[PDB]
Design an enzyme around this catalytic site. Structure first.
Site, PDB file in Angstrom:
ATOM      1  N   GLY A 130       0.761  -1.256   0.000  1.00 52.36           N
ATOM      2  CA  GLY A 130       0.000   0.000   0.000  1.00 52.36           C
ATOM      3  C   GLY A 130       0.790   1.304   0.000  1.00 52.36           C
ATOM      4  O   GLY A 130       0.230   2.365   0.328  1.00 52.36           O
ATOM      5  N   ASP A 150       3.990  -1.191 -13.614  1.00 50.55           N
ATOM      6  CA  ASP A 150       4.930  -1.594 -12.562  1.00 50.55           C
ATOM      7  C   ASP A 150       5.846  -2.706 -13.008  1.00 50.55           C
ATOM      8  O   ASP A 150       7.012  -2.766 -12.588  1.00 50.55           O
ATOM      9  CB  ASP A 150       4.186  -2.060 -11.304  1.00 50.55           C
ATOM     10  N   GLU A 200       0.626 -12.513 -12.277  1.00 55.29           N
ATOM     11  CA  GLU A 200      -0.117 -11.790 -11.269  1.00 55.29           C
ATOM     12  C   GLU A 200      -1.581 -11.583 -11.643  1.00 55.29           C
ATOM     13  O   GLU A 200      -2.480 -11.809 -10.820  1.00 55.29           O
ATOM     14  CB  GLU A 200       0.571 -10.442 -10.944  1.00 55.29           C
ATOM     15  N   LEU A 256       4.208   2.641  -4.380  1.00 57.65           N
ATOM     16  CA  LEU A 256       5.485   2.524  -5.097  1.00 57.65           C
ATOM     17  C   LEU A 256       5.576   1.311  -6.012  1.00 57.65           C
ATOM     18  O   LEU A 256       6.660   0.962  -6.486  1.00 57.65           O
ATOM     19  CB  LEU A 256       6.654   2.520  -4.117  1.00 57.65           C
TER      20      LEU A 256
END
Ligand SMILES: OC[C@H]1O[C@H](O)[C@@H](O)[C@@H](O)[C@@H]1O
Ligand SMILES: OC[C@H]1O[C@H](O)[C@@H](O)[C@@H](O)[C@@H]1O
Ligand SMILES: [Cl-]
Ligand SMILES: [Cl-]
Ligand SMILES: [Cl-]
Ligand SMILES: [Cl-]
Ligand SMILES: [Cl-]
Ligand SMILES: [Cl-]
Ligand SMILES: [Cl-]
Ligand SMILES: [Cl-]
Lengths: 345, 345
Positions: free
Chosen positions: A112, A162, A150, A115
């Site tokens: 959370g 990301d 993912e 980043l």
């Protein structure tokens, strides 16, 4: 003899465009994201074992142990990402024969933080296996694999930015199109521009965001249910990402701060929980102290904030932020993507 | 047209040997220091002015303004270091003719952090003038000038290691002899060693140290008054700096942690206020959580602590330190020394 491998991958600041890289938007209109990796890392470690078992250890120290079985490990809701990376590697590169090893992860920022740590963690687990198995996976392939693992194998919703920052490293402007097509544009930023930018950025950790899932769901609903104004806010997020990229390439700091202000307004208008009264109070105080622009990194709702402050107001901003709940730090960029090294064998 | 120059210089972690670089010890027995620059900076900015004045602005936002006079500025106790740098540059490079400019500084860590910021600030002011005046000062000359300005012109007591880290950058093993003779040995550390070291280091900011002056005074008195045991503690500080340097060059992490433990014991024995009950409690808690070694960076008495922790205990250490007064951060090294860039003219 036992093998020990470590890998690391840098976390990232979402400078502009975040949210446009998520499925419904990116597939329909095309997304743009400008991001940059910083000097904080996710890590993975593989240790081969002398017993017939597999062990998984997470950043928050959950731990699972299994016996060596010639079937894929079940994704039961505990350490799914670890198991899914392991499953993929054993199936695709080891002909389905289990390997006795311990896969552990840790990270310089908690969950959370805004980043990009969730996806960065997947990249770094893949990289450790790349090193262990000596795989010829290129950067595009690693980032694409991390997405698949993912978002598909583990069914966790989100975007694409990301995976690419963690893998490639540096300042990148990314273009996201339908059918999982991504173009990474490394930005070759002049040295004076990088130095000036670091001298003008202040990071402020506000606490854990629990809003990422909700914001991404809301932004996806904007598109699917044709919410006109909220879609137009997202078009604005996209436009300002391109303006910011050109500002950095041209060393135009006036245009950079203007685009961040417009981007932040658009981002807040794209989903209800991107900002809140607590974040707005901090933002307002930072501006009054002399910051010219600021925003939340990541989806929103908490995590890291970043502020652009002229150097003559920098110490005043740092003092002011001291009076609020959270932690100040400088901003230092990294040019390298994910890397691995050996400790044993 | 107005000229704007900025310069930055990295702050440093004192890994070993700190204290042996101070006058009585270094002149009598020779000192060794092992240090490494990190990703936090001191900055200086020069702006030429269109009015006949000189203005100085400090990190904690003290401000002095003077009219343009053809005499050296008086070192009256306010912004002495700024004025002394200005005085030296005008006298030696501008034939004694005043230049209308504003010299300002700011820093990523406050005073008393144990990161060498006082001397790093002097280096960065010199570097801005090097850039402004296009001076051919080499790295040895810049570090030597910073020493002279701070220790002689401004009469502030201390050692030599910070001037060299700020100027040269990177991991350096320094040898300090009589008559201001210093040898800088850049350590060409293998990539795997650097990565392993960053993966194993945790930084912990404990608060401001007010002990530096007292510790350095005490260590100097050890030598002058022939305090046998306390001198032998300092010989131990020196010995372990060499052991640690060889450990890093050989990638021997077992020897690295052993030398840090012995170094820390010796350092605490060299001066009464290096540690205290508060620092010892944090240290004890870190060891219990799984750290293998640790120490205070800088002279002692507060500021940054650093811990060496095996990667499987890293997150536990971070959690534990969360329960104490202060701020946790990762440790990221920088290879570059002081740098300058232009914004106008
Ligand atoms: O929604 C903002 C951001 O959140 C996460 O970090 C990921 O899903 C990204 O792909 C996305 O850009
Ligand atoms: O005493 C430890 C340390 O304190 C300051 O940072 C300087 O005076 C250094 O030269 C010295 O090594
Ligand atoms: Cl963004
Ligand atoms: Cl995160
Ligand atoms: Cl995020
Ligand atoms: Cl983002
Ligand atoms: Cl030291
Ligand atoms: Cl300091
Ligand atoms: Cl110090
Ligand atoms: Cl030191």
């Amino acid at each position: 003899n036992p093998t020990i491998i470590r890998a690391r991958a840098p976390l990232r600041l979402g400078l502009a465009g975040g949210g446009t890289d998520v499925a419904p938007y990116a597939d329909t209109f095309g997304g743009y994201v400008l991001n940059a990796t910083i000097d904080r890392y996710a890590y993975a470690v593989i240790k081969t074992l002398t017993i017939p078992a597999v062990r998984f250890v997470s950043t928050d120290q959950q731990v699972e142990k299994h016996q060596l079985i010639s079937e894929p490990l079940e994704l039961n809701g505990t350490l799914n990402l670890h198991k899914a990376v392991y499953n993929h590697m054993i199936r695709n590169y080891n002909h389905g024969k289990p390997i006795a090893l311990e896969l552990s992860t840790f990270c310089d920022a908690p969950a959370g933080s805004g980043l990009g740590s969730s996806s960065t963690l997947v990249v770094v687990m893949i990289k450790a296996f790349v090193e262990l198995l000596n795989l010829p996976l290129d950067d595009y392939a690693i980032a694409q694999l991390a997405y698949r693992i993912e978002r598909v194998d583990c069914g966790l919703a989100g975007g694409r930015q990301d995976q690419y920052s963690a893998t490639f490293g540096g300042f990148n402007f990314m273009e996201f199109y339908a059918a999982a097509r991504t173009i990474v544009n490394p930005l070759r930023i002049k040295n004076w521009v990088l130095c000036e930018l670091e001298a003008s950025l202040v990071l402020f950790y506000t606490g854990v965001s629990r809003e990422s899932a909700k914001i991404i769901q809301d932004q996806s609903d904007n598109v699917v249910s044709h919410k006109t104004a909220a879609i137009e806010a997202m078009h604005g997020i996209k436009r300002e990402a391109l303006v910011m990229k050109e500002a950095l390439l041209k060393g135009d700091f006036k245009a950079f701060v203007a685009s961040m202000r417009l981007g932040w307004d658009n981002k807040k208008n794209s989903a209800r929980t991107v900002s809140n009264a607590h974040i707005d109070e901090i933002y307002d105080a930072a501006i009054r102290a002399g910051a010219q622009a600021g925003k939340v990194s990541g989806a929103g709702g908490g995590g890291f904030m970043l502020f652009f402050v002229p150097t003559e107001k920098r110490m005043d901003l740092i003092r002011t932020l001291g009076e609020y709940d959270g932690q100040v730090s400088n901003c230092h960029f990294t040019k390298n993507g994910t890397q691995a090294w050996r400790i044993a064998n």
